[PDB]
Structure formats: structure tokens, C-alpha cells
Nucleic acid binder design. Structure first.
Ligand SMILES: [Mg+2]
Ligand SMILES: [Mg+2]
Lengths: 218, 218
RNA sequence: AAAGGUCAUUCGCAAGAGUGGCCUUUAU
RNA sequence: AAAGGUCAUUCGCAAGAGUGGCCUUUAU
């Protein structure tokens, strides 16, 4: 079973218990799970990615590098990189389903495990990591594009035009506690739009997206 | 002069312009300054710190490791570790004076410089880093303690007791725009307290501290 | 950690930038 | 990234825990 993953990883563990720990969620084993390895892998993987980002990024301005780095270490991207490994069929869990949060954390812990198993050889681990994902990362860096959210876009418009910030007002809150529906109002000067979502922010983001369009019509 | 810093670092650079760039603020050189190196150094050092932290921490709980890690990569701590280096006498800058934010950023950039100049040798750089600071880090980790802020403590108190959170509002704002004084009000149930500070958060932190007392005195 | 506004101050013919304080938005 | 409250759900005699939703605090 593990031999398969080791083959996809291109690395054979000296300590197989270290590899399964990385693959084990707290629900399956409360004494030997990946939580602490995840803490380490996050730092480790963060380093490998930044190093690539600094070398190959077309734009080295902080406002570009920071948002892009955040995406390159996001759960989303990690799940994207993990596909190749098929972690979903090596992961051990009980009270839960192997969602994208679990996958991303196991991905991080998995890299910490390799690092440790190899006698804490960062250089070796970085290369193994690059041999597997360098191209995929450089690819995403080349097609890198920072995109602002509506709430941010809106206040930059209003701070430019009237040097003021839009007022977000909570209008309604319906539904059961585990699935609420929020209706918020965005207002600037005398303009006001509405927005709804499953969270205040989502609702405000919708509201803001409207106030922008509203303002375009002038 | 650079030779003096290399002796403190315990490493001789092949590319001196690299060491120089790490020491150079944008005010002194618009084209070759430490901004990008700082980006990378932060990631590299974060990894050095975390690795030590997962191996030597008294407590491995997320709620302990996280707050503690935050302090271990904070500007405050880096200035502490950087003292020994006397970076203040090596940093190049025009517009301003070498403050703790500068020192902290140059500390990070410097390690990025060492990393790159050594041909991206992570193991080497890590050991050089430890040779200089492992002792100080282990010591801080041994004294490691999570310090909660008043606002956090207040809502945990009010949420345990009443399942509700305190509320803040600004009472008044005094002084010039570049030096304001805020007076804020903190409340829970029928209890209200005031606090003042150079910012809303400082004011609220102060107000929260007062309300905690008010609650103890019942 | 990044983004916008703003006050002060510094460099600058200008453009524009540095530094310090404040407000807000985003991400983790 | 961490902390606290809350709803749902799963495991549990209980304590307590896991997973999903929401609110909030902190840090960068
Ligand atoms: Mg994670
Ligand atoms: Mg920094």
C-alpha cells in the first residue's frame, strides 16, 4: 500500500511509521497523528515555494508577490499538487471524510515526514519536491495574476472619488444557526445596494459588487 | 568593514554585492536594496525557527506552538538575536534612522543572502544560523508562555459566563491627525468602562482591562 | 503579509519616493 | 495561524473528542 505512495513520491522511508503518521488523522489515532508534522511541513513547503517565487516571478513588487504566494500555499493549490499523489487512498481517518482540508494538511505533513526521515536534509527534500512540482509551480507563477475582491475595489473607488469609505449595514439574518442567510446593505453618499450570502462578508462582497456597478452607471 | 560582519556571521561571501544588497535600504539605493531578500529570508528563518520549535517545545499543542512561533519570528525577537551582529553599524540608509523595523528586515535579508551566496545550501545556512542562535531560541522556547491580551480574555470571560461578547464604541477623538487620542467604551450586560490610547485598539485594550476588573469586583 | 485613504516630516526642479502616526479592506 | 462562544452532525455511559456552518478576539 505505502510502497505505492513511496513510488509516486520517489522516496522510500527508512521509518514507515513516520510515513503513516503523516497519513494519519487524529480521529484514527489520537496518539500518532499528523498535526505536529503539518506544523513543520507548512514552514518547510512555504520555504520551497517562496524560493521559487523569488527566482522566477516576473513581477517582484510586494503587492504582487504577497497575494500570489498566498495562493501558492493555499489549500486549493496544495490539493491541486496532491492529485498526482492520490493521497485520498493512503489517508487514515475515522470520524470524517477526506475533504480538501485534510488533503492539504496531509500534503504538508507528508513533506515534513520526508524531511525528518532523510535525517533532516532540507536540500534533498527541496529537490525531491521540485522534481515533483517545480514545473507546476513555475507554470502557475508565469500565469500569476493578483485579483482584488469587490470590498477592496469599492473602497479604493470611493476613497479616490470622495475620499470616504462605504458603510456596510446588516439588514437581515434568517435560517437555522447551522445555515444562516445574511442580507447586508452597502452605502456611499446616497447610493445603496443590497447583498446576501451565507456569511456577513459574503453578503457584503455581493453588496459591494453591486454598488460598484451602480456607481458605473453614475 | 564587511569583513567584520562576515567574521561575526562566521561566513565569507563570494559575491560581496549580495551581502551589500542585504544591508541596503531602498533610500540609499533605488535599484539594489534588501526588499526581495527580506521576502525570502522571512520564509527561510521561519523554517529554521519552526524546526527547532517542533523538536524542543515543552508543549506540542497548536494553541501553544502558534502564539510562541509568532513571537519567535517577531521583529522584537529578531532585534534581540541581531544585537550580537551589530547590524546598526553595517546598514546603509539615507531617509531616516536605523530603527527596529529596519534591523529586523535586514536580519531576514542577510540570511537570504547567505542562503543564496552559498549556492542555495539550506542545510549549511540552517547550521550557521543555529551556531549563532540555537541557544537563544531554545532558551526562549523553554520560557515559552502564551500571553493573552485583555480583549481576548474579556470575551472568553463573558462568553463562558453569558455566552455573549462585549461591545466597543468610540466616545471621542482628540489631537492632530498624526497624533490622535481615542477614548473608547467597553460594555457587557449593564457594565461599561472607558479606555484611552493612541489607536482604537490600544484604547479598547485598555477599556477591556478595566471591564475585567469591574467584573471581578462584581 | 499585502492594498487604498489620510496627517506629519524628509529628499526631489517635477515625477515620484523614504520615514513615523492614524483609519479601513483583504489574506492566513 | 491560533483562541473563545454557538448550531448541526458523528463517536461516547460520561468526561470529552472529530467533522461541517456561523459569530468574535488576537497575531502577521
Ligand atoms: Mg494546513
Ligand atoms: Mg520583515
Amino acid at each position: 500500500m505505502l510502497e505505492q505512495l513511496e513510488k509516486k513520491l520517489g522516496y522510500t522511508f527508512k521509518d514507515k511509521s513516520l510515513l503513516e503518521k503523516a497519513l494519519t488523522h487524529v480521529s484514527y489515532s489520537k496518539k500518532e497523528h499528523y498535526e505536529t508534522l503539518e506544523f513543520l511541513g507548512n514552514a518547510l513547503v512555504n520555504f520551497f515555494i517562496v524560493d521559487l517565487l523569488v527566482q522566477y516571478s516576473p513581477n517582484k513588487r510586494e503587492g504582487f508577490l504577497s497575494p500570489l504566494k498566498a495562493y501558492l500555499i493555499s489549500e486549493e493549490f496544495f490539493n491541486l499538487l496532491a492529485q498526482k499523489l492520490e493521497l485520498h487512498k493512503f489517508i487514515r481517518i475515522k470520524r470524517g471524510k477526506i475533504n480538501e482540508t485534510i488533503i492539504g494538511d496531509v500534503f504538508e505533513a507528508l513533506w515534513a515526514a520526508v524531511y525528518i526521515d532523510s535525517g533532516r536534509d532540507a536540500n534533498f527534500t527541496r529537490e525531491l519536491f521540485y522534481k515533483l512540482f517545480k514545473e507546476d509551480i513555475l507554470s502557475a507563477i508565469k500565469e500569476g495574476r493578483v485579483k482584488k475582491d469587490y470590498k477592496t475595489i469599492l473602497q479604493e473607488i470611493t476613497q479616490k472619488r470622495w475620499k470616504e469609505r462605504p458603510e456596510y449595514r446588516l439588514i437581515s439574518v434568517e435560517g437555522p444557526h447551522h445555515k444562516k442567510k445574511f442580507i447586508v446593505e452597502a452605502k456611499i453618499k446616497e447610493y445603496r445596494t443590497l447583498g446576501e450570502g451565507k456569511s456577513k462578508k459574503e453578503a457584503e462582497q455581493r453588496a459591494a459588487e453591486e454598488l460598484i456597478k451602480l456607481l458605473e452607471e453614475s
